[PDB]
Amino acid sequence: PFFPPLYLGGPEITTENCEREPIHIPGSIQPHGALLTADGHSGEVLQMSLNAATFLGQEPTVLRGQTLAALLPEQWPALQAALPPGCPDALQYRATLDWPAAGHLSLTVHRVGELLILEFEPTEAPHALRNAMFALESAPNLRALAEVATQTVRELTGFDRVMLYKFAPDATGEVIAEARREGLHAFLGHRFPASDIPAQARALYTRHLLRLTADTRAAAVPLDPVLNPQTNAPTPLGGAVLRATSPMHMQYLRNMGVGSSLSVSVVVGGQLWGLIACHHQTPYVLPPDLRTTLEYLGRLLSLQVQVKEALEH
Amino acid sequence: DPLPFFPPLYLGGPEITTENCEREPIHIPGSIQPHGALLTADGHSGEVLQMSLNAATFLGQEPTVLRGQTLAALLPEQWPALQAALPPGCPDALQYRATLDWPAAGHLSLTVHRVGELLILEFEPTEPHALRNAMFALESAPNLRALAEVATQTVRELTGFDRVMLYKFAPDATGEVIAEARREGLHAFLGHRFPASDIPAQARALYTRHLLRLTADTRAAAVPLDPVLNPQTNAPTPLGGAVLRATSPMHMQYLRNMGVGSSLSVSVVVGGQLWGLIACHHQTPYVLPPDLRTTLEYLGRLLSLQVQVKEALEH
Ligand SMILES: *C/C=C1/C(=C/c2[nH]c(/C=C3[NH+]=C(/C=C4\NC(=O)C(C=C)=C4C)C(C)=C\3CCC(=O)O)c(CCC(=O)O)c2C)NC(=O)[C@H]1C
Ligand SMILES: *C/C=C1/C(=C/c2[nH]c(/C=C3[NH+]=C(/C=C4\NC(=O)C(C=C)=C4C)C(C)=C\3CCC(=O)O)c(CCC(=O)O)c2C)NC(=O)[C@H]1C
């Protein structure tokens, strides 16, 4: 099982007890967006990230009273239809909001039990995705598929390094393709222990297929209140991309000289086959619409890996 | 009985009947649908060889002027990209797409693929989070029926088509409509089954490699290529990978008898086999722009993946 989180008097995490860190409930988010939780029926805002005034423009404790019906009149009915009670936590709905102060905001919502989790990020206001799709499909074998996938993603994103990281049957990792900027260490061909991506992370990544750390030196922003009023318990944040990254993994990234990290799960036959794993040397917030392109490529690659491995075997 | 293709009509081949359906060489009709234009060019020199007879209307140029230039002169910014995207020996399924600002005809969508030493260039006029929301909705559908229903409803909302069907093949190649979204007043095809010969063997083979085809207007006359044969080979120009390809007259007749003015389908391919089609009808003629068709192409791949995932749970 998991330990209690740090904010509920749980022990500090070390290399001895990696597997037991409750990474899904850090009680905090990354500072490049804002997060609100809300009741499923009433639409009453229960928790907010302390930075919410920056993004939303409203005052701190005035939001706590209001309902989503009031705040988001046009979207609140769509949210009720899109995310009905009993739907999975993996199901997400997105909209673009013309907010007065902050301009265009991306809104991403999902449901966990009776709670709606709302994420707000800045956002902007072509054929590279279609061209990529056809390129992946005409790759003659798994090796070429891997090369095309890493190169495509680097071209779409500008990331300093993009790797395809394949899990062996014992969860040992191997870098089987790599696209990188000139003047970086090559990780191509190297292998890494299973504990670098511990079992609870692997399980989470089988269900929610994208996660990132935008800035490996940025401080997390707590939720207020930290605990969910409904349950007096931790708010599950595993399906929230804004979730704070495990401090252990943030230290690991800094030791590698990485300023920004992102990965996308490749899932084949219900199992985590591998990751499209990205690094940038400097901090880097990839905008939500470009992340959606990588999410699409995750599904396409999942399909193409099966197709290609049927030819291998 | 599987039998090889007849020569096309323009090489003295016989007229097609219900007795010889399967032998129609549907891939080499020598003609296109009138809502776009098509050019062929030599893959190394870029010399323009064939053009649809309507090419002047779309490109705003004299045919003799078009044919007297290379693609290097005609498309100075695209030509190097084409060469890089479509290297010699690449499969004919591989497509490169770009948007052009053409003075006489506004924004054109350019779609290119390579067959041997020939480049085939298709030109069509072109012009928020629905796809992402659809992706997650499809993945959360609890079983195969719910997946089929969400998929048909989603395609109908995106396109406005009068009818959208999920058409599933049985092992004997008969087909059945297993879900549909339809306009009010249309009679249901749900549960109906159809013979294998309605989608003959050469079409099914073609539809396993090239995953989208359409007939924008079921009464429109086809536009010949000029010249009709490829000058490189003095043989027919393969058009199986061109969406502008003229549709079999036999299928056009079938659609007119049903009261269908526009038709479109997307292949659902599972384990290298044609599992089914997303099949769409409109009562009036209807041109879906290339960027909206790309959304349906993505959905085709997602559905292929999800059908495999849902059927694995059904065991
Ligand atoms: C005591 C536990 C340890 C630990 C924990 C840990 N690791 C992750 C997540 C990731 N680790 C990754 C590992 C690599 N990245 C690379 O670039 C390479 C090789 C060149 C490796 C082996 C990756 C890719 C992830 C996923 C996240 C990402 O893409 O950045 C977590 C979970 C983090 C989270 O989601 O909150 C945890 C708890 N890592 C260790 O090395 C030991 C000390
Ligand atoms: C003598 C040959 C015949 C024949 C040939 C034929 N049919 C197609 C293509 C299609 N037929 C389809 C059939 C149906 N559409 C429906 O809506 C229903 C039922 C409600 C059925 C059974 C479909 C979906 C296609 C695919 C194209 C499309 O989506 O419109 C071809 C190939 C056409 C081409 O690609 O050029 C051919 C040669 N059909 C017959 O019925 C017999 C007379």
Numbering used by the authors:
A (entry chain A): 7 to 131, 137 to 324
B (entry chain B): 4 to 130, 137 to 324
What do the authors of the reporting publication say about this deposited model?
Prototypical phytochromes can exist in two photochemical states with differential cellular signaling activity, called red light-absorbing (Pr) and far-red light-absorbing (Pfr) state. Light is detected by a bilin chromophore, which is covalently linked to the photosensory core of the protein, comprising of PAS (Per/Arndt/Sim), GAF (cGMP phosphodiesterase/adenyl cyclase/FhlA) and PHY (phytochrome-specific) domains. Important for the signaling is a stretch of amino acids in the PHY domain, called the PHY-tongue, which changes from a β-sheet in Pr into an α-helix in Pfr state The chromophore connects to the PHY-tongue via a strictly conserved aspartatic acid, which is expected to play a crucial role in signal transduction. To address this gap of knowledge, we recorded time-resolved serial femtosecond X-ray crystallographic (SFX) data of the PAS-GAF domains of the phytochrome from Deinococcus radiodurans (DrBphPCBD) at 1 ps and 10 ps after femtosecond optical excitation.
Two propionate side chains additionally anchor the chromophore non-covalently to the protein. The pyrrole water is ubiquitously found in phytochrome structures. The strictly conserved Asp207 is a key residue for signal transduction because it connects the chromophore to the PHY-tongue in Pr and Pfr. The A-ring is covalently attached to the protein backbone in phytochromes, which renders complete isomerization impossible, but is sufficiently flexible to accommodate the proposed changes.
